Amino acid sequence: GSERQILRLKQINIQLATKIQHLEFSSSEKEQEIERLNKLLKQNGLLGD
Amino acid sequence: GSERQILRLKQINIQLATKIQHLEFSSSEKEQEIERLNKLLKQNGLLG
């Protein structure tokens, strides 16, 4: 149907909105690991000066 | 009518799909940054 696109898009967009939140969490976990590693390298003299 | 509603839903859909592609790309960049930081820790004897 032409109008039949309505439900399909609605439902895809809900799934994509959810997937964005999962990907934001996983991206944040990786940022926190990067910060942890940068601190370890800095405390050990390996991040410059 | 329905044609305008559909166009708006398609606009939202591409904005969401673009954001997902960005987060997948940035997350893979971050995994590479983690691998490089881990290699430098291993090389300096901080990973056993």
Side-chain angles (χ1 to χ4, degrees):
Chain A
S2 176
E3 63 288 333
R4 185 64 187 72
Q5 299 178 83
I6 293 170
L7 179 62
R8 172 185 75 78
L9 292 160
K10 181 188 171 179
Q11 295 188 324
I12 290 163
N13 288 351
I14 289 165
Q15 286 179 5
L16 299 185
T18 297
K19 174 70 160 332
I20 288 164
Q21 298 307 307
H22 293 166
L23 284 171
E24 282 287 0
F25 186 87
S26 61
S27 174
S28 179
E29 285 229 293
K30 295 181 201 308
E31 288 172 338
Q32 284 157 57
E33 177 70 357
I34 292 166
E35 178 181 340
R36 193 188 70 81
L37 295 175
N38 282 342
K39 285 182 176 170
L40 189 51
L41 281 155
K42 182 179 141 40
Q43 277 161 21
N44 283 284
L46 305 165
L47 215 72
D49 277 269
Chain B
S2 67
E3 287 321 305
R4 304 182 167 288
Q5 295 182 76
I6 291 169
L7 189 72
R8 173 61 174 173
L9 283 165
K10 285 184 176 168
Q11 181 201 344
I12 290 171
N13 178 253
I14 184 285
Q15 283 182 186
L16 298 170
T18 298
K19 180 155 192 175
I20 287 172
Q21 288 170 343
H22 169 70
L23 288 163
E24 291 170 332
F25 181 100
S26 70
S27 286
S28 178
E29 296 300 291
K30 287 175 190 339
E31 282 293 335
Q32 186 64 11
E33 289 180 8
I34 290 170
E35 176 183 334
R36 299 195 279 241
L37 298 166
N38 286 328
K39 283 184 171 204
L40 264 8
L41 287 165
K42 172 185 172 219
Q43 283 163 198
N44 290 285
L46 286 170
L47 203 50

PDB file of all heavy atoms in Angstrom, chain A residues 7-40:
ATOM      1  N   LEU A   7       3.182   2.354   8.903  1.00  0.00           N
ATOM      2  CA  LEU A   7       3.487   1.482  10.017  1.00  0.00           C
ATOM      3  C   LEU A   7       4.906   0.964   9.907  1.00  0.00           C
ATOM      4  O   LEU A   7       5.635   0.868  10.943  1.00  0.00           O
ATOM      5  CB  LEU A   7       2.540   0.296  10.038  1.00  0.00           C
ATOM      6  CG  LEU A   7       2.846  -0.661  11.194  1.00  0.00           C
ATOM      7  CD1 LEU A   7       2.671   0.043  12.548  1.00  0.00           C
ATOM      8  CD2 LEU A   7       1.995  -1.998  11.069  1.00  0.00           C
ATOM      9  N   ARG A   8       5.344   0.633   8.704  1.00  0.00           N
ATOM     10  CA  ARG A   8       6.657   0.053   8.547  1.00  0.00           C
ATOM     11  C   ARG A   8       7.709   1.054   9.025  1.00  0.00           C
ATOM     12  O   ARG A   8       8.644   0.672   9.786  1.00  0.00           O
ATOM     13  CB  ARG A   8       6.936  -0.318   7.094  1.00  0.00           C
ATOM     14  CG  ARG A   8       8.401  -0.755   6.839  1.00  0.00           C
ATOM     15  CD  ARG A   8       8.680  -1.001   5.327  1.00  0.00           C
ATOM     16  NE  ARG A   8       8.798   0.252   4.525  1.00  0.00           N
ATOM     17  CZ  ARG A   8       9.871   1.042   4.480  1.00  0.00           C
ATOM     18  NH1 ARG A   8      10.945   0.753   5.175  1.00  0.00           N
ATOM     19  NH2 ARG A   8       9.873   2.139   3.747  1.00  0.00           N
ATOM     20  N   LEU A   9       7.624   2.301   8.548  1.00  0.00           N
ATOM     21  CA  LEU A   9       8.560   3.328   9.035  1.00  0.00           C
ATOM     22  C   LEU A   9       8.491   3.608  10.493  1.00  0.00           C
ATOM     23  O   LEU A   9       9.516   3.742  11.184  1.00  0.00           O
ATOM     24  CB  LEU A   9       8.382   4.621   8.244  1.00  0.00           C
ATOM     25  CG  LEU A   9       8.833   4.485   6.763  1.00  0.00           C
ATOM     26  CD1 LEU A   9       8.195   5.584   5.972  1.00  0.00           C
ATOM     27  CD2 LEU A   9      10.394   4.531   6.634  1.00  0.00           C
ATOM     28  N   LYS A  10       7.282   3.682  11.044  1.00  0.00           N
ATOM     29  CA  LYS A  10       7.129   3.865  12.464  1.00  0.00           C
ATOM     30  C   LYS A  10       7.852   2.832  13.276  1.00  0.00           C
ATOM     31  O   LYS A  10       8.613   3.136  14.198  1.00  0.00           O
ATOM     32  CB  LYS A  10       5.664   3.831  12.806  1.00  0.00           C
ATOM     33  CG  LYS A  10       5.229   4.031  14.270  1.00  0.00           C
ATOM     34  CD  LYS A  10       3.717   3.736  14.315  1.00  0.00           C
ATOM     35  CE  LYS A  10       3.319   3.709  15.711  1.00  0.00           C
ATOM     36  NZ  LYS A  10       1.899   3.469  16.069  1.00  0.00           N
ATOM     37  N   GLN A  11       7.676   1.579  12.899  1.00  0.00           N
ATOM     38  CA  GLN A  11       8.270   0.521  13.639  1.00  0.00           C
ATOM     39  C   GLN A  11       9.778   0.404  13.436  1.00  0.00           C
ATOM     40  O   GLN A  11      10.506   0.106  14.407  1.00  0.00           O
ATOM     41  CB  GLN A  11       7.575  -0.788  13.389  1.00  0.00           C
ATOM     42  CG  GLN A  11       6.112  -0.625  13.968  1.00  0.00           C
ATOM     43  CD  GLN A  11       5.350  -1.852  13.975  1.00  0.00           C
ATOM     44  OE1 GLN A  11       5.476  -2.676  13.064  1.00  0.00           O
ATOM     45  NE2 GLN A  11       4.441  -1.954  14.962  1.00  0.00           N
ATOM     46  N   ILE A  12      10.266   0.619  12.224  1.00  0.00           N
ATOM     47  CA  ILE A  12      11.710   0.687  12.016  1.00  0.00           C
ATOM     48  C   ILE A  12      12.301   1.813  12.901  1.00  0.00           C
ATOM     49  O   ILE A  12      13.332   1.607  13.553  1.00  0.00           O
ATOM     50  CB  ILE A  12      12.020   0.950  10.539  1.00  0.00           C
ATOM     51  CG1 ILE A  12      11.685  -0.260   9.662  1.00  0.00           C
ATOM     52  CG2 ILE A  12      13.535   1.356  10.299  1.00  0.00           C
ATOM     53  CD1 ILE A  12      11.584   0.041   8.204  1.00  0.00           C
ATOM     54  N   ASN A  13      11.662   2.972  12.894  1.00  0.00           N
ATOM     55  CA  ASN A  13      12.255   4.103  13.572  1.00  0.00           C
ATOM     56  C   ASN A  13      12.311   3.826  15.067  1.00  0.00           C
ATOM     57  O   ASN A  13      13.253   4.241  15.722  1.00  0.00           O
ATOM     58  CB  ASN A  13      11.486   5.373  13.296  1.00  0.00           C
ATOM     59  CG  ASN A  13      11.688   5.871  11.874  1.00  0.00           C
ATOM     60  OD1 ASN A  13      12.537   5.368  11.135  1.00  0.00           O
ATOM     61  ND2 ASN A  13      10.896   6.814  11.482  1.00  0.00           N
ATOM     62  N   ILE A  14      11.356   3.125  15.675  1.00  0.00           N
ATOM     63  CA  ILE A  14      11.428   2.766  17.074  1.00  0.00           C
ATOM     64  C   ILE A  14      12.631   1.816  17.333  1.00  0.00           C
ATOM     65  O   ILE A  14      13.355   1.976  18.308  1.00  0.00           O
ATOM     66  CB  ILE A  14      10.080   2.186  17.526  1.00  0.00           C
ATOM     67  CG1 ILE A  14       9.025   3.310  17.579  1.00  0.00           C
ATOM     68  CG2 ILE A  14      10.251   1.469  18.860  1.00  0.00           C
ATOM     69  CD1 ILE A  14       7.567   2.815  17.666  1.00  0.00           C
ATOM     70  N   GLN A  15      12.809   0.848  16.432  1.00  0.00           N
ATOM     71  CA  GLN A  15      13.962  -0.048  16.591  1.00  0.00           C
ATOM     72  C   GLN A  15      15.287   0.702  16.425  1.00  0.00           C
ATOM     73  O   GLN A  15      16.228   0.464  17.217  1.00  0.00           O
ATOM     74  CB  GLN A  15      13.897  -1.107  15.481  1.00  0.00           C
ATOM     75  CG  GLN A  15      12.782  -2.192  15.708  1.00  0.00           C
ATOM     76  CD  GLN A  15      12.748  -3.176  14.596  1.00  0.00           C
ATOM     77  OE1 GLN A  15      13.582  -3.159  13.682  1.00  0.00           O
ATOM     78  NE2 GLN A  15      11.785  -4.065  14.657  1.00  0.00           N
ATOM     79  N   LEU A  16      15.353   1.622  15.471  1.00  0.00           N
ATOM     80  CA  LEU A  16      16.610   2.377  15.333  1.00  0.00           C
ATOM     81  C   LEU A  16      16.857   3.290  16.542  1.00  0.00           C
ATOM     82  O   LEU A  16      17.987   3.435  16.992  1.00  0.00           O
ATOM     83  CB  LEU A  16      16.584   3.201  14.070  1.00  0.00           C
ATOM     84  CG  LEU A  16      16.441   2.419  12.787  1.00  0.00           C
ATOM     85  CD1 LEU A  16      16.571   3.394  11.599  1.00  0.00           C
ATOM     86  CD2 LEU A  16      17.386   1.237  12.642  1.00  0.00           C
ATOM     87  N   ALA A  17      15.812   3.921  17.092  1.00  0.00           N
ATOM     88  CA  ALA A  17      15.964   4.760  18.243  1.00  0.00           C
ATOM     89  C   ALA A  17      16.497   3.961  19.396  1.00  0.00           C
ATOM     90  O   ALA A  17      17.364   4.451  20.181  1.00  0.00           O
ATOM     91  CB  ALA A  17      14.595   5.421  18.569  1.00  0.00           C
ATOM     92  N   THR A  18      16.051   2.708  19.577  1.00  0.00           N
ATOM     93  CA  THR A  18      16.532   1.845  20.622  1.00  0.00           C
ATOM     94  C   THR A  18      17.994   1.458  20.395  1.00  0.00           C
ATOM     95  O   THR A  18      18.818   1.496  21.342  1.00  0.00           O
ATOM     96  CB  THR A  18      15.667   0.602  20.693  1.00  0.00           C
ATOM     97  OG1 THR A  18      14.313   0.996  21.037  1.00  0.00           O
ATOM     98  CG2 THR A  18      16.157  -0.388  21.700  1.00  0.00           C
ATOM     99  N   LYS A  19      18.319   1.135  19.157  1.00  0.00           N
ATOM    100  CA  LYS A  19      19.683   0.691  18.821  1.00  0.00           C
ATOM    101  C   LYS A  19      20.623   1.872  19.113  1.00  0.00           C
ATOM    102  O   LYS A  19      21.735   1.617  19.604  1.00  0.00           O
ATOM    103  CB  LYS A  19      19.745   0.334  17.362  1.00  0.00           C
ATOM    104  CG  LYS A  19      21.176   0.006  16.913  1.00  0.00           C
ATOM    105  CD  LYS A  19      21.672  -1.277  17.463  1.00  0.00           C
ATOM    106  CE  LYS A  19      22.875  -1.772  16.585  1.00  0.00           C
ATOM    107  NZ  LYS A  19      22.808  -1.282  15.119  1.00  0.00           N
ATOM    108  N   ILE A  20      20.254   3.121  18.811  1.00  0.00           N
ATOM    109  CA  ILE A  20      21.110   4.255  19.129  1.00  0.00           C
ATOM    110  C   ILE A  20      21.402   4.236  20.629  1.00  0.00           C
ATOM    111  O   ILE A  20      22.582   4.497  21.012  1.00  0.00           O
ATOM    112  CB  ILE A  20      20.461   5.567  18.719  1.00  0.00           C
ATOM    113  CG1 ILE A  20      20.515   5.634  17.192  1.00  0.00           C
ATOM    114  CG2 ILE A  20      21.084   6.764  19.391  1.00  0.00           C
ATOM    115  CD1 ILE A  20      19.579   6.682  16.608  1.00  0.00           C
ATOM    116  N   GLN A  21      20.437   4.013  21.503  1.00  0.00           N
ATOM    117  CA  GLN A  21      20.749   4.033  22.905  1.00  0.00           C
ATOM    118  C   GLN A  21      21.733   2.925  23.332  1.00  0.00           C
ATOM    119  O   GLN A  21      22.650   3.196  24.092  1.00  0.00           O
ATOM    120  CB  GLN A  21      19.450   3.960  23.751  1.00  0.00           C
ATOM    121  CG  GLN A  21      18.530   5.152  23.521  1.00  0.00           C
ATOM    122  CD  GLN A  21      19.255   6.443  23.709  1.00  0.00           C
ATOM    123  OE1 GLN A  21      19.858   6.616  24.746  1.00  0.00           O
ATOM    124  NE2 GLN A  21      19.068   7.380  22.826  1.00  0.00           N
ATOM    125  N   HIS A  22      21.549   1.770  22.727  1.00  0.00           N
ATOM    126  CA  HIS A  22      22.563   0.661  23.013  1.00  0.00           C
ATOM    127  C   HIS A  22      23.934   1.047  22.517  1.00  0.00           C
ATOM    128  O   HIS A  22      24.931   0.826  23.231  1.00  0.00           O
ATOM    129  CB  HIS A  22      22.093  -0.599  22.265  1.00  0.00           C
ATOM    130  CG  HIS A  22      20.805  -1.214  22.761  1.00  0.00           C
ATOM    131  ND1 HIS A  22      20.113  -2.156  22.022  1.00  0.00           N
ATOM    132  CD2 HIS A  22      20.095  -1.013  23.880  1.00  0.00           C
ATOM    133  CE1 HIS A  22      19.041  -2.535  22.706  1.00  0.00           C
ATOM    134  NE2 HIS A  22      19.016  -1.868  23.849  1.00  0.00           N
ATOM    135  N   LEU A  23      24.025   1.678  21.364  1.00  0.00           N
ATOM    136  CA  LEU A  23      25.324   2.016  20.802  1.00  0.00           C
ATOM    137  C   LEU A  23      25.875   3.149  21.602  1.00  0.00           C
ATOM    138  O   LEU A  23      27.123   3.244  21.804  1.00  0.00           O
ATOM    139  CB  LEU A  23      25.184   2.451  19.346  1.00  0.00           C
ATOM    140  CG  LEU A  23      24.953   1.304  18.398  1.00  0.00           C
ATOM    141  CD1 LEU A  23      24.624   1.802  17.060  1.00  0.00           C
ATOM    142  CD2 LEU A  23      26.183   0.411  18.268  1.00  0.00           C
ATOM    143  N   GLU A  24      25.084   4.079  22.167  1.00  0.00           N
ATOM    144  CA  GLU A  24      25.646   5.155  22.976  1.00  0.00           C
ATOM    145  C   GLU A  24      26.250   4.528  24.235  1.00  0.00           C
ATOM    146  O   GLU A  24      27.294   5.087  24.708  1.00  0.00           O
ATOM    147  CB  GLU A  24      24.531   6.103  23.474  1.00  0.00           C
ATOM    148  CG  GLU A  24      24.094   7.047  22.354  1.00  0.00           C
ATOM    149  CD  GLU A  24      25.096   8.155  22.017  1.00  0.00           C
ATOM    150  OE1 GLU A  24      26.150   8.210  22.651  1.00  0.00           O
ATOM    151  OE2 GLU A  24      24.885   8.966  21.074  1.00  0.00           O
ATOM    152  N   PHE A  25      25.626   3.513  24.791  1.00  0.00           N
ATOM    153  CA  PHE A  25      26.135   2.980  26.049  1.00  0.00           C
ATOM    154  C   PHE A  25      27.477   2.364  25.748  1.00  0.00           C
ATOM    155  O   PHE A  25      28.433   2.550  26.542  1.00  0.00           O
ATOM    156  CB  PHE A  25      25.180   2.210  26.814  1.00  0.00           C
ATOM    157  CG  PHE A  25      25.752   1.832  28.170  1.00  0.00           C
ATOM    158  CD1 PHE A  25      25.636   2.688  29.263  1.00  0.00           C
ATOM    159  CD2 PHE A  25      26.504   0.671  28.318  1.00  0.00           C
ATOM    160  CE1 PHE A  25      26.148   2.312  30.477  1.00  0.00           C
ATOM    161  CE2 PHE A  25      27.088   0.319  29.492  1.00  0.00           C
ATOM    162  CZ  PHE A  25      26.871   1.099  30.576  1.00  0.00           C
ATOM    163  N   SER A  26      27.563   1.572  24.666  1.00  0.00           N
ATOM    164  CA  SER A  26      28.799   0.850  24.332  1.00  0.00           C
ATOM    165  C   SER A  26      29.848   1.815  23.954  1.00  0.00           C
ATOM    166  O   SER A  26      31.040   1.632  24.414  1.00  0.00           O
ATOM    167  CB  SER A  26      28.530  -0.241  23.349  1.00  0.00           C
ATOM    168  OG  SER A  26      28.042   0.298  22.199  1.00  0.00           O
ATOM    169  N   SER A  27      29.576   2.915  23.304  1.00  0.00           N
ATOM    170  CA  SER A  27      30.542   3.920  22.966  1.00  0.00           C
ATOM    171  C   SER A  27      31.046   4.522  24.299  1.00  0.00           C
ATOM    172  O   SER A  27      32.285   4.734  24.458  1.00  0.00           O
ATOM    173  CB  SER A  27      29.829   5.020  22.140  1.00  0.00           C
ATOM    174  OG  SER A  27      30.725   6.089  21.922  1.00  0.00           O
ATOM    175  N   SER A  28      30.165   4.759  25.264  1.00  0.00           N
ATOM    176  CA  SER A  28      30.577   5.396  26.529  1.00  0.00           C
ATOM    177  C   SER A  28      31.475   4.468  27.280  1.00  0.00           C
ATOM    178  O   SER A  28      32.463   4.981  27.920  1.00  0.00           O
ATOM    179  CB  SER A  28      29.289   5.515  27.408  1.00  0.00           C
ATOM    180  OG  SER A  28      29.639   6.117  28.659  1.00  0.00           O
ATOM    181  N   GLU A  29      31.214   3.160  27.232  1.00  0.00           N
ATOM    182  CA  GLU A  29      32.068   2.202  27.941  1.00  0.00           C
ATOM    183  C   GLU A  29      33.430   2.231  27.334  1.00  0.00           C
ATOM    184  O   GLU A  29      34.434   2.114  28.076  1.00  0.00           O
ATOM    185  CB  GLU A  29      31.508   0.826  27.795  1.00  0.00           C
ATOM    186  CG  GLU A  29      30.299   0.594  28.637  1.00  0.00           C
ATOM    187  CD  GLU A  29      30.381  -0.700  29.459  1.00  0.00           C
ATOM    188  OE1 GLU A  29      30.371  -1.799  28.843  1.00  0.00           O
ATOM    189  OE2 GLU A  29      30.457  -0.622  30.728  1.00  0.00           O
ATOM    190  N   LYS A  30      33.546   2.347  26.015  1.00  0.00           N
ATOM    191  CA  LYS A  30      34.857   2.426  25.380  1.00  0.00           C
ATOM    192  C   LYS A  30      35.515   3.730  25.760  1.00  0.00           C
ATOM    193  O   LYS A  30      36.750   3.728  26.016  1.00  0.00           O
ATOM    194  CB  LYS A  30      34.754   2.388  23.835  1.00  0.00           C
ATOM    195  CG  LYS A  30      34.227   1.083  23.367  1.00  0.00           C
ATOM    196  CD  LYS A  30      34.152   1.019  21.827  1.00  0.00           C
ATOM    197  CE  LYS A  30      33.153  -0.058  21.327  1.00  0.00           C
ATOM    198  NZ  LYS A  30      33.404  -1.371  21.921  1.00  0.00           N
ATOM    199  N   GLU A  31      34.833   4.877  25.788  1.00  0.00           N
ATOM    200  CA  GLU A  31      35.466   6.149  26.235  1.00  0.00           C
ATOM    201  C   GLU A  31      36.012   5.981  27.646  1.00  0.00           C
ATOM    202  O   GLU A  31      37.081   6.507  27.981  1.00  0.00           O
ATOM    203  CB  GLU A  31      34.462   7.296  26.213  1.00  0.00           C
ATOM    204  CG  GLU A  31      34.094   7.758  24.831  1.00  0.00           C
ATOM    205  CD  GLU A  31      32.936   8.799  24.787  1.00  0.00           C
ATOM    206  OE1 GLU A  31      32.111   8.901  25.757  1.00  0.00           O
ATOM    207  OE2 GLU A  31      32.841   9.486  23.745  1.00  0.00           O
ATOM    208  N   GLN A  32      35.282   5.347  28.528  1.00  0.00           N
ATOM    209  CA  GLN A  32      35.761   5.251  29.930  1.00  0.00           C
ATOM    210  C   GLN A  32      37.004   4.367  29.937  1.00  0.00           C
ATOM    211  O   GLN A  32      37.923   4.637  30.733  1.00  0.00           O
ATOM    212  CB  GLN A  32      34.726   4.630  30.801  1.00  0.00           C
ATOM    213  CG  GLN A  32      33.575   5.649  31.132  1.00  0.00           C
ATOM    214  CD  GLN A  32      32.304   4.968  31.518  1.00  0.00           C
ATOM    215  OE1 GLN A  32      32.254   4.154  32.469  1.00  0.00           O
ATOM    216  NE2 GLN A  32      31.240   5.286  30.787  1.00  0.00           N
ATOM    217  N   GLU A  33      37.119   3.341  29.091  1.00  0.00           N
ATOM    218  CA  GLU A  33      38.295   2.474  29.035  1.00  0.00           C
ATOM    219  C   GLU A  33      39.487   3.239  28.488  1.00  0.00           C
ATOM    220  O   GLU A  33      40.583   3.181  29.089  1.00  0.00           O
ATOM    221  CB  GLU A  33      38.008   1.153  28.325  1.00  0.00           C
ATOM    222  CG  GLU A  33      39.245   0.289  28.199  1.00  0.00           C
ATOM    223  CD  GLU A  33      39.746  -0.290  29.506  1.00  0.00           C
ATOM    224  OE1 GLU A  33      39.164   0.001  30.609  1.00  0.00           O
ATOM    225  OE2 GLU A  33      40.707  -1.081  29.478  1.00  0.00           O
ATOM    226  N   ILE A  34      39.271   4.100  27.509  1.00  0.00           N
ATOM    227  CA  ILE A  34      40.296   4.974  26.971  1.00  0.00           C
ATOM    228  C   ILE A  34      40.828   5.917  28.056  1.00  0.00           C
ATOM    229  O   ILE A  34      42.041   6.060  28.197  1.00  0.00           O
ATOM    230  CB  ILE A  34      39.807   5.718  25.746  1.00  0.00           C
ATOM    231  CG1 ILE A  34      39.619   4.680  24.618  1.00  0.00           C
ATOM    232  CG2 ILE A  34      40.767   6.866  25.368  1.00  0.00           C
ATOM    233  CD1 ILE A  34      38.791   5.245  23.434  1.00  0.00           C
ATOM    234  N   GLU A  35      39.923   6.463  28.835  1.00  0.00           N
ATOM    235  CA  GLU A  35      40.384   7.369  29.896  1.00  0.00           C
ATOM    236  C   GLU A  35      41.172   6.599  30.908  1.00  0.00           C
ATOM    237  O   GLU A  35      42.233   7.099  31.353  1.00  0.00           O
ATOM    238  CB  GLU A  35      39.181   7.965  30.529  1.00  0.00           C
ATOM    239  CG  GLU A  35      39.586   8.901  31.687  1.00  0.00           C
ATOM    240  CD  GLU A  35      38.362   9.481  32.356  1.00  0.00           C
ATOM    241  OE1 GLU A  35      37.271   9.490  31.738  1.00  0.00           O
ATOM    242  OE2 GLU A  35      38.482   9.908  33.524  1.00  0.00           O
ATOM    243  N   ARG A  36      40.701   5.440  31.327  1.00  0.00           N
ATOM    244  CA  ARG A  36      41.466   4.581  32.218  1.00  0.00           C
ATOM    245  C   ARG A  36      42.877   4.247  31.724  1.00  0.00           C
ATOM    246  O   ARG A  36      43.845   4.358  32.491  1.00  0.00           O
ATOM    247  CB  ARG A  36      40.670   3.278  32.545  1.00  0.00           C
ATOM    248  CG  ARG A  36      41.304   2.539  33.707  1.00  0.00           C
ATOM    249  CD  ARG A  36      40.633   1.157  33.897  1.00  0.00           C
ATOM    250  NE  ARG A  36      40.939   0.183  32.828  1.00  0.00           N
ATOM    251  CZ  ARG A  36      42.037  -0.518  32.792  1.00  0.00           C
ATOM    252  NH1 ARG A  36      43.017  -0.418  33.726  1.00  0.00           N
ATOM    253  NH2 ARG A  36      42.267  -1.414  31.863  1.00  0.00           N
ATOM    254  N   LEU A  37      43.044   3.883  30.482  1.00  0.00           N
ATOM    255  CA  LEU A  37      44.278   3.557  29.917  1.00  0.00           C
ATOM    256  C   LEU A  37      45.186   4.826  29.813  1.00  0.00           C
ATOM    257  O   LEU A  37      46.394   4.705  30.088  1.00  0.00           O
ATOM    258  CB  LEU A  37      44.091   2.904  28.544  1.00  0.00           C
ATOM    259  CG  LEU A  37      43.384   1.558  28.588  1.00  0.00           C
ATOM    260  CD1 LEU A  37      43.175   1.124  27.175  1.00  0.00           C
ATOM    261  CD2 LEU A  37      44.147   0.498  29.371  1.00  0.00           C
ATOM    262  N   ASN A  38      44.590   5.943  29.382  1.00  0.00           N
ATOM    263  CA  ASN A  38      45.396   7.180  29.319  1.00  0.00           C
ATOM    264  C   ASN A  38      45.935   7.508  30.707  1.00  0.00           C
ATOM    265  O   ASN A  38      47.106   7.901  30.830  1.00  0.00           O
ATOM    266  CB  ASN A  38      44.537   8.312  28.839  1.00  0.00           C
ATOM    267  CG  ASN A  38      44.312   8.308  27.325  1.00  0.00           C
ATOM    268  OD1 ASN A  38      45.050   7.652  26.557  1.00  0.00           O
ATOM    269  ND2 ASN A  38      43.293   8.997  26.909  1.00  0.00           N
ATOM    270  N   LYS A  39      45.114   7.351  31.768  1.00  0.00           N
ATOM    271  CA  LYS A  39      45.627   7.632  33.142  1.00  0.00           C
ATOM    272  C   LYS A  39      46.718   6.707  33.536  1.00  0.00           C
ATOM    273  O   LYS A  39      47.709   7.156  34.169  1.00  0.00           O
ATOM    274  CB  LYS A  39      44.434   7.606  34.084  1.00  0.00           C
ATOM    275  CG  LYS A  39      43.675   8.885  33.866  1.00  0.00           C
ATOM    276  CD  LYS A  39      42.463   9.039  34.767  1.00  0.00           C
ATOM    277  CE  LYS A  39      41.887  10.433  34.471  1.00  0.00           C
ATOM    278  NZ  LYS A  39      40.544  10.682  35.078  1.00  0.00           N
ATOM    279  N   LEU A  40      46.641   5.434  33.181  1.00  0.00           N
ATOM    280  CA  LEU A  40      47.653   4.459  33.522  1.00  0.00           C
ATOM    281  C   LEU A  40      48.930   4.832  32.821  1.00  0.00           C
ATOM    282  O   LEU A  40      50.046   4.796  33.435  1.00  0.00           O
ATOM    283  CB  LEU A  40      47.180   3.040  33.164  1.00  0.00           C
ATOM    284  CG  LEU A  40      47.974   1.814  33.621  1.00  0.00           C
ATOM    285  CD1 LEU A  40      48.289   1.831  35.143  1.00  0.00           C
ATOM    286  CD2 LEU A  40      47.076   0.635  33.292  1.00  0.00           C
TER     287      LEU A  40
END
